Design an enzyme around this catalytic site. Structure first.
Site, mmCIF file in Angstrom:
data_model
loop_
_atom_site.group_PDB
_atom_site.id
_atom_site.type_symbol
_atom_site.label_atom_id
_atom_site.label_comp_id
_atom_site.label_asym_id
_atom_site.label_seq_id
_atom_site.Cartn_x
_atom_site.Cartn_y
_atom_site.Cartn_z
ATOM 1 C CB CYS C 39 -1.028 -0.100 1.203
ATOM 2 S SG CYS C 39 -1.846 1.213 1.474
ATOM 3 C CB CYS C 42 -1.065 1.779 4.166
ATOM 4 S SG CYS C 42 -2.584 1.357 3.360
#
Lengths: 34, 61, 116, 382, 48
Positions: C39, C42
């Site tokens: 990600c 993230c």
């Protein structure tokens, strides 16, 4: 400058505190001598 | 990852390496045009669809 | 082991442990973080959650779930995007909250203070 | 709705329908490689080697609108936000970059980005969640549709996320009907959310109604092989001959850039389609038209800056550049040479968008995009 | 067809297999390093 973050290494551990195993307090050393 | 063995050998033995030829070493050149007709065919004498070819003389049972 | 402090406070839990936590009795608000290593945004969410886990010493519990490990469980929780947070009230009467995107930390504080 | 005196401004407006969100990655699958559960300092190693679906990950529609207006175009966004601080800051962020917000509706019933669910323990011990109260973004009804953006806009752009909620299905279809009544094109972006990656048949059933209404469709390489056959198109990619190669390029084991034939994409083709775009990241763009098809060649480089590389948001820039060049040059529809020449601007924008952290922080400018296009491509191509 | 470098391996009716190679032009008074068919590795020298 915000340390931690994505572009900084892991925090440097205190060398005395990092020695978890090969190090004992004075009280235990005194206890184990007798 | 497949390959064909290639043994140098040659009735000689000094250190005896050997090669593996894969699809990454050799390729195919695309289609071209050329002549491929060179024959000395004979005349058939078809019997039971198994061929009894004979050119000069008649059928020889 | 009590000699050197842990660098990271958020503890990673499996799907079954999260099910037990939600089902079992609780007295503090619960935070569930959905994240993956590949990600992009993230990393910032992880940093903000790590900061938030320090201010709320014992008044809240913060955990994270890796969707690369538990994919079907994340799908069942109605997750349609990686930077997702779930706020769980300590009481069964109040319903849960789902937040999507890189939300600011202050709105997180408002969420688990004025709404949980 | 007929109120106007003077002709519209020079750059045609773009209609961006969807949900306003900050740093959202819809397309999520199971990545084979993971890099430590706690230490996020090493997670950037997954940006140099993407999991082949996050290679060029698209995002929300606000990102596409921002990238389009930053490339020299004009965009407008239709959506709903709550009367919160976050909702008031999202519209501020969109307004700061000349994105028209005449069609953004503020409401107080729901909270921005917050949705109320309920725990629904089923048989065994597997928990579930059911949406009790919907989030503010996905709560737009057909009554509050700005009948001025739809009339003016020449391209209607939306993504598949709005197909995951009941009310937005009807609202989106009403907006599509209005825009088509006013003569605007429909641009469909297939950034599939996580629940839509479950099975091919269910997704095809879900998106069929939206698919048949689209005039231009943009999908990734994985979002097309998933929609046709994942196993077949994965077996075909990893194949090397047992004895001897075929031409010579097969004897070099280069990467597989397969140009799908018109008889394989036929199940996804219909009469109303004007363009089908398949992007393999920023590497290549396969374009299919009613009378011709081809592939535009590009490159990528994220190791040029290994510490500030973040692939998130590049697909939005690619789509925004495609839309900008579509509206600027109206002769690309029936000219393959012009189509190929104008499709490298999108590749340059996508290359630039991967050189910084943050989807909206580092969207490229038009001048920078042109500079990179001219610096990478030989003068004959550009 | 613009044939490539190599040695013809197969002479089929309308195709040829080339097996690839790499020419190295060598001048008079040069020192070849190795006998015929010497297994040449990735970095070892050929001629001085």
């Amino acid at each position: 400058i915000d340390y931690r973050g994505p572009d900084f290494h892991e925090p440097t551990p205190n060398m005395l505190a990092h020695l978890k195993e090969h190090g004992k307090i004075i009280s235990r050393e005194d206890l184990e001598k007798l | 990852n497949q390959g064909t063995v290639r043994t140098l050998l040659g009735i000689n033995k000094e250190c005896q390496f050997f090669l593996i030829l894969s699809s990454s070493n050799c390729f195919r050149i695309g289609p071209f045009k050329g002549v491929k007709y060179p024959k000395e065919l004979i005349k058939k004498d078809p019997l039971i669809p198994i061929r009894n070819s004979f050119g000069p003389l008649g059928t020889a049972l | 082991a009590k000699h050197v402090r842990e660098d990271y406070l958020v503890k990673k839990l499996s799907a079954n442990e999260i099910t037990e936590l939600v089902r079992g009795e609780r007295n503090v608000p619960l935070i569930i973080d959905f994240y993956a290593t590949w990600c992009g945004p993230c990393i910032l969410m992880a940093q903000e959650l790590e900061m938030l886990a320090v201010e709320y010493e014992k008044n809240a519990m913060i955990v994270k779930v890796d969707t690369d490990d538990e994919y079907e469980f994340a799908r069942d929780m109605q997750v349609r995007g990686l930077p997702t947070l779930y706020f769980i009230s300590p009481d069964p009467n109040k319903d849960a909250i789902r937040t999507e995107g890189l939300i600011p930390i202050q709105m997180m504080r408002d969420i688990l203070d004025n709404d949980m | 709705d007929d109120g106007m005196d003077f002709p519209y401004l020079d750059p045609p407006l773009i209609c961006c329908f969807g949900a306003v969100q900050k740093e959202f990655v819809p397309s999520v699958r199971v990545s084979e490689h993971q890099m430590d559960p706690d230490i996020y300092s090493g997670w950037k190693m997954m940006q140099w080697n993407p999991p082949e679906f996050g290679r060029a990950p698209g995002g929300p529609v606000s990102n596409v609108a921002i990238s389009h207006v930053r490339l020299g175009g004009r965009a407008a966004v239709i959506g709903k936000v709550g009367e919160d601080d976050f909702g008031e800051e999202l519209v501020l962020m969109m307004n700061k970059e000349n994105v028209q917000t005449r069609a953004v509706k503020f409401d107080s019933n729901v909270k921005t980005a917050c949705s109320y669910m309920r725990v629904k323990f089923s048989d065994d011990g597997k928990m579930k969640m059911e949406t009790v109260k919907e989030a503010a973004e996905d709560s737009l009804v057909a009554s509050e549709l700005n009948l001025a953006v739809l009339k003016e806009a020449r391209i209607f752009h939306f993504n598949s996320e709005v197909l995951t909620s009941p009310s937005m299905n009807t609202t989106l279809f009403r907006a599509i009907k209005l825009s088509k009544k006013f003569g605007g094109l429909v641009f469909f972006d297939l950034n599939l959310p996580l629940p839509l990656w479950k099975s091919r048949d269910e997704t095809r059933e879900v998106i069929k109604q939206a698919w048949e209404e689209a005039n231009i469709i943009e999908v990734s390489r994985e979002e097309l092989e998933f929609l046709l056959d994942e196993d077949h198109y994965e077996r075909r990619k990893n194949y090397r001959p047992q004895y001897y190669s075929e031409n010579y390029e097969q004897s070099k084991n280069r990467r597989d850039y397969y140009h799908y034939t018109r008889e394989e994409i036929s199940p996804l083709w219909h009469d109303g389609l004007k363009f089908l775009f398949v992007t393999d990241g920023t590497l290549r763009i396969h374009y299919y038209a009613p009378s011709f098809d081809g592939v535009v060649v590009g490159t990528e480089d994220v190791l040029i800056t290994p510490f500030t590389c973040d692939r998130t948001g590049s697909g939005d820039a690619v789509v925004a550049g495609i839309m900008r060049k579509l509206t600027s040059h109206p002769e690309m529809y029936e000219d393959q040479d012009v189509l190929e020449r104008q499709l490298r601007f999108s590749i340059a924008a996508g290359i630039i968008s991967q050189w910084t952290i943050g989807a909206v922080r580092g969207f490229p400018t038009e001048s920078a995009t042109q500079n990179l296009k001219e610096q990478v491509y030989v003068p004959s191509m550009w | 067809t613009h044939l490539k470098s190599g040695q013809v391996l197969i002479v089929q009716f309308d195709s040829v297999v080339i097996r690839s190679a790499k020419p190295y032009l060598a001048t008079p008074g040069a020192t070849l390093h190795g006998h015929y068919g010497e297994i040449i590795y990735e970095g070892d020298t050929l001629v001085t």
